[model samples]
Target: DTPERRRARARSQILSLAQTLLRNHADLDRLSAAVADGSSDAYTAAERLFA
Candidate 1:
């Protein structure tokens, strides 16, 4: 696949996983709070997930 297609696929997969996490485990407020309190380590980890 082209780089654009690969990026789209990766974006979709990440969204799907996030949806599943929200549906099965996280509440919206809780997730929002986590994001608001996120650290550099957390951001790095998130990037590594898709890297």
Candidate 2:
């Protein structure tokens, strides 16, 4: 995949996993924050990694 595609896929995967975890764990607030943090971190890291 292209760098952008790879980054998008990584982000999607992270959000999907986070959503699943949240559903099972039943912590919407925490889950939301976690997803946000994860997405931000992932995007930044992925950009640096791919760049």
Candidate 3:
């Protein structure tokens, strides 16, 4: 029971971390593309991309 509970908690954390990393990766990919095409500030470009 102890090992099972610990594994379950670790799995939950790993899943959450994986999702967050995936989301950041996608956002960075888009932002990189946007920056490549635009002369505007990165912050502004991200706003437009997400907007």
Candidate 4:
């Protein structure tokens, strides 16, 4: 596979992880806040789940 295709595969996993995390409004808000801040560990939690 090409480098770009590999990235696309992981991109889907990340989005899936985000969707999987969707629950309460507060949960959504927390992830959103983490996403807004570069230093925060927003997606890492989801990545761990996917792993």
Local distance difference test values of all predictions, in order = 0.63, 0.61, 0.73, 0.65
TM-score for predicted model 3 compared with the true structure: 0.44
**Which residue pairs show collisions in model 3?**
none
How well is each residue in 1-51 modelled by candidate 3, as lDDT tens digits? 699999999999998997776567656776777678785668776565442
lDDT of 3 at 37: 78
TM-score head-to-head 1 vs 2, winner: 1
Q: After superposing candidate 4 on the true structure, give the runs of residues whose Cα lies further than 4 Å from its correct spot.
A: 24-51
For candidate 4, lDDT tens digit of each residue in 1-49?
9999999999999888767565433455556667677645766744434
> Where is model 2 more than 4 Å wrong at Cα?
26-51
The alpha-carbon RMSD values of the candidates against the true structure, listed in the order shown, are: 6.9, 10.9, 6.6, 8.1
What does candidate 4 score on TM? 0.42
In model 2, the worst 10-residue window by lDDT is 42-51
- 29-51, model 2: which lDDT tens digit per residue? 55456558775454444334221
Clash pairs, candidate 1, are none
Flag the better candidate by lDDT, 2 or 4.
4
Per-candidate TM-scores read 0.43, 0.42, 0.44, 0.42
Candidates 1 and 2, the one with greater lDDT: 1
Question: Can you write out model 1's per-residue Cα lDDT over 1-51, one digit (the tens) per residue?
Answer: 999999999999999998777556534445446667773345554443332
For candidate 2, list the clashing residue pairs, or say none.
none
